[PDB]
């Protein structure tokens, strides 16, 4: 059931979590990507990525405040995906699609990998 | 903007955060309401409530792992609102609307107070 639903609720929650990230409020992890640092909320990362879900459900790794990703990872690709996690918007361009796809495969972001493969197949 | 958007992203993030709450994964606060305890994620509470936003942006209160609410607050009303925070769905019924509205006013959940006032005005 006898529920009502607020259509904009989930997107408003995301917008507010992105504002907390922008102001560095309650961020609890630093992700390091080829010497560049990105602050974030562990719960948002886990909710969006198979890799972060595996890391932060691990009894040892859940205690870490700094996570280093493989240095071959493209930090612009990571930044594009982190923005997607917090906004639902993916800035996919001809010049970044290969890097974004590789990063999404590494992060285990299935829907993102799916859309990249579709855009690449349409280009060929 | 040159973005694409994943329609279900924000609701999938909420569904996953609700699954973390159900499994007690990375919950970082206990809310106590008339001797009943509710575990949650501070960031989700802040994103949904003016009261929790004020508490967890305070330099002293942000360190607390237990928050006691006014004991006059109805814990069923709180539980209904916590479920709304994590699902966008509000279980509003004739038998709980007055308690839900009072709790939403206390929590500073403006859109919820708005819909309660509308349903009450339609009933009179």
């Amino acid at each position: 059931d006898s529920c009502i639903q607020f259509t904009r609720h989930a997107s408003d929650v995301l917008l507010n979590l992105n504002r907390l990230r922008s102001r560095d409020i309650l961020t609890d992890v630093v992700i390091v990507v080829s010497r560049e640092q990105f602050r974030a909320h562990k719960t948002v990362l886990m909710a969006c990525s198979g890799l972060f879900y595996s890391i932060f459900t691990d009894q040892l790794k859940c205690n870490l405040s700094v996570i280093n990703l493989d240095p071959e990872i493209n930090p612009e690709g990571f930044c594009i995906l982190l923005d997607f996690m917090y906004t639902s918007r993916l800035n996919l361009r001809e010049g970044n699609i290969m890097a974004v796809m590789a990063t999404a495969m590494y992060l285990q972001m299935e829907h993102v990998v799916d859309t990249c493969r579709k855009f690449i197949k349409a280009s060929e | 903007d040159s973005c694409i958007q994943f329609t279900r992203h924000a609701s999938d993030v909420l569904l996953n955060l609700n699954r973390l709450r159900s499994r007690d994964i990375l919950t970082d606060v206990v809310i106590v309401v008339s001797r009943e305890q509710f575990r949650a994620h501070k960031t989700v509470l802040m994103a949904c409530s003016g009261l929790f936003y004020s508490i967890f942006t305070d330099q002293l209160k942000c360190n607390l792992s237990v928050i006691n609410l006014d004991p006059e607050i109805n814990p069923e009303g709180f539980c209904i609102l916590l479920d709304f925070m994590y699902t966008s769905r509000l279980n509003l019924r004739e038998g709980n609307i007055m308690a839900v509205m009072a709790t939403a006013m206390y929590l500073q959940m403006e859109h919820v107070v708005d819909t309660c006032r509308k349903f009450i005005k339609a009933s009179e």
Partner: peptide
């Protein structure tokens, strides 16, 4: 907004 889910 409010709708029927």
């Amino acid at each position: 907004a409010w709708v029927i889910p």
